[PDB]
Ligand binder design. Structure first.
Ligand SMILES: *[C@@H]1O[C@H](CO)[C@@H](O[C@@H]2O[C@H](CO)[C@@H](O)[C@H](O)[C@H]2NC(C)=O)[C@H](O)[C@H]1NC(C)=O
Ligand SMILES: *[C@@H]1O[C@H](CO)[C@@H](O)[C@H](O)[C@H]1NC(C)=O
Ligand SMILES: *[C@H]1O[C@H](CO)[C@@H](O)[C@H](O)[C@H]1NC(C)=O
Ligand SMILES: *[C@H]1O[C@H](CO)[C@@H](O)[C@H](O)[C@H]1NC(C)=O
Ligand SMILES: [Cl-]
Ligand SMILES: [Cl-]
Lengths: 394, 21, 394
């Protein structure tokens, strides 16, 4: 009743493995999803995947555009990525113009929220920074806090931390909470003094985002100012790098470890609430195998990006299927994209829900030190984005 | 100040939030 | 003696005639220049000009890419515009990637200053904000002022004034001048009370940028607060439609005209220095009539963008010539862009110089109220970017 459909897919992520979502780290997860899928769609249905370097910048647009201009005026069927904010905007806009469906585990900034026009064909399968903001909001109502200090590093390039706190800002502003803003370029000489003093001037609760080592330093100077130990509540966001949100975040096998350890007693770290299942185990095994066979010193496991792209593919099929039913083709991107919104499905790690606006609902955890003597850090509370409930742990 | 050392990425999207030292 | 040439140029501007640089308004200027060049180019040469709507947005990129994709890779030999900042960035980036020369009487923002990579094929024929920022620096050193309040309206859309004052901020920064920054959305619900309060709270010298009307309101509230008697020195930037003086930029035939007149006594307006020539006269008229019998009324003297685009044509022709005479072709885009830089020529309004970075040197004037009773405003001083010296009018 249907011929072997053939999907031409364009994946745009960085060739450089410095990124957690590099082509080498993600490609395996994409391939995994492509087996359990080519094993819902008519038999023979194949996916032709082109893995192109986004260079986390202009390259994403150059390659997409050179590809469509070189080979006739033919557009790929699906586009995966870019992840990087400044790299995705131009591709999302073009995708919406060409009615092509675009799915990313990134493009987390607050501006992609408005999909009435330019970003209409974009569905984000990973939690946007705004979802993270709604989380802090609940964290704040819980403690009756109403004012905060947003401290972040702004490199004026990829601006990950700036877009991150922009997510908290947007939500706080629409709700009424006041917020002192303070930024610096952790790429320059850290005047970790004006920071700690501006902090001590602004508010009692501080929301931060900068490199792991930077937050460590800031937390030290603060310590040198007796700003830890109940006076101020410090928060730092580490949503993706398992290395940075793993127990003993203070410990660096260095001289400061003793001092550092004492500062973090006032520090709380925000990260994603991950869930696993048996099937998720095979996935992690095969992915590690490829990545290692690829000479890449296996990080530690599968992050939100690797996982998200795998679920992006099953999400694309789940929508192609329903578009292919109602009498449409792989060329009605707009229709496909609408079939990815407002729904729940089964990803490699558990239930995945994309909201009415095409954005994946996010669940978060708060990591705090529950034993100052030892340094035992454990999840204190969890926030479930769909339900919108924050709740401490027993 | 709400400008920072630069803004390099002018003509990108980034127009939803300031900065300041 | 060479074979006739066929030059394809893509003009990307807004079709909407509310902007001063709309296709309807600029086209006449382009055709004037084109006619005046033919009799530098091999005899029989011709120009194929395509006029495409930029929508002052993503459409600039949308039609450029679609046209090249349709032509199966064929590219224009010259791109004129966009003017709007967010529209020119992507076009400038592609033009560079494709080695296509791009000239514009816009793209005034600071970011376009950096042409080592991303924006190498961009030549700005109208004076950039940073240049206007150098003028202010001269004005300031002349009055020996070293601090300033920057008050501007921020659209979060086109953001002209944001980019305008960023030009001043960038210059004052490198130099050391202190600056307070304060922004508001003049479109949204205005609150002139908070504006003036921040003003008096920070610096005695204020540099503003917003609609002529919005500035007027700010000056009324300032006057009603006694800040105009001579305790503050206000400035505003109206680089493109500063023709209200001569009758009184405060005059609105409004019932506040008296207040205004007095308020504006402590206000100075920085605008472009516009020089005349017989040619400019005849050019102004024709362009004016062409526009007139088109449905639009035009300010006696054509604006900077219209004039700038005329000189862009000449400039391009002056570069293509020298490129040809050296064995290269119109397809050596970078080589053509380089011939347009660090060179001085004769535009329609007089000399035009473009620095070693491919950015035009701009001349400015400062208008002040010379007689508070009448309300007479006059250019009290001018600045000459190339010479780099500011001088009050004898
Ligand atoms: C994951 O986070 C770790 C930090 O926990 C990053 O490693 C640090 O990288 C910086 C500069 O690259 C070094 O100066 C630090 O010494 C590193 N920390 C240690 C001790 O490992 C790591 O780069 C991150 N991984 C990714 C892919 O971003
Ligand atoms: C989302 O889909 C559900 C069906 O699963 C439907 O009941 C609900 O109304 C939808 N939400 C909207 C209004 O988009
Ligand atoms: C520019 O501003 C002046 C002053 O308000 C106005 O008279 C003129 O019509 C404007 N130019 C156009 C037509 O956009
Ligand atoms: C213009 O300045 C450049 C420096 O970038 C210099 O090389 C050149 O000689 C100057 N123009 C000429 C040829 O006089
Ligand atoms: Cl990317
Ligand atoms: Cl434009």
């Amino acid at each position: 009743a249907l011929p072997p459909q053939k999907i031409e897919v364009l994946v745009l992520l960085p060739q450089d493995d410095s990124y957690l979502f590099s082509l080498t780290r993600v490609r395996p997860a994409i391939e995994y999803a492509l087996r359990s899928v080519e094993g819902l769609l008519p038999p023979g249905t194949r996916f032709q995947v082109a893995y192109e370097d986004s260079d986390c910048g202009n390259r994403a647009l150059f390659s997409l555009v050179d590809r469509v201009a070189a080979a006739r005026g033919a557009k790929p069927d699906l586009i995966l990525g870019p992840v990087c904010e400044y790299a995705a905007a131009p591709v999302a806009r073009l995708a919406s113009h060409w009615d092509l469906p675009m799915l990313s585990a990134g493009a987390l900034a607050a501006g992609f929220q408005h999909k009435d026009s330019e970003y209409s064909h974009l569905t984000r399968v990973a939690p946007a920074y705004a979802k993270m903001g709604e989380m802090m909001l609940a964290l704040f109502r819980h403690h009756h806090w109403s004012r905060a200090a947003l401290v972040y590093s702004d490199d004026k390039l990829e601006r990950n931390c700036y877009f991150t706190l922009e997510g908290v800002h947007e939500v706080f502003q629409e709700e009424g909470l006041h917020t002192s803003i303070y930024s610096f370029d952790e790429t320059k000489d850290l005047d970790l003094e004006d920071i700690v003093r501006n902090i001590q001037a602004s508010e009692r609760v501080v929301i931060m985002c900068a490199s792991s080592d930077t937050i460590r330093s800031i937390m030290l100077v603060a310590h040198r100012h007796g700003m830890t130990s109940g006076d101020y509540a410090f928060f730092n966001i580490e949503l993706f790098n398992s290395s940075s949100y793993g127990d003993g975040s203070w410990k660096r096998g260095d001289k400061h470890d003793f001092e550092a350890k004492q500062a973090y007693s006032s520090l709380q770290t925000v990260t994603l609430l991950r869930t696993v299942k048996p099937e998720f185990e095979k996935f992690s095994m095969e992915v590690k195998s490829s990545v290692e066979k690829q000479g890449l010193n296996m990080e530690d496991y599968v992050n939100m990006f690797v996982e998200g792209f795998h679920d992006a593919i099953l999400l694309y099929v789940l929508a192609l299927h329903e578009v292919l039913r109602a009498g449409y083709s792989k060329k009605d991107g707009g229709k496909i994209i609408q079939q990815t919104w407002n729904r729940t499905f089964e990803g490699i790690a558990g239930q995945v829900s994309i909201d009415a606006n095409g954005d994946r609902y996010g669940d978060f955890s708060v990591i705090a030190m529950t034993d100052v003597e030892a340094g035992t850090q454990e999840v204190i509370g969890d926030y479930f984005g769909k339900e919108g409930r924050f709740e401490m742990r027993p | 100040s709400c400008f920072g050392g630069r803004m390099d990425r002018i003509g990108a999207q980034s127009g939803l939030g300031c900065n300041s030292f």
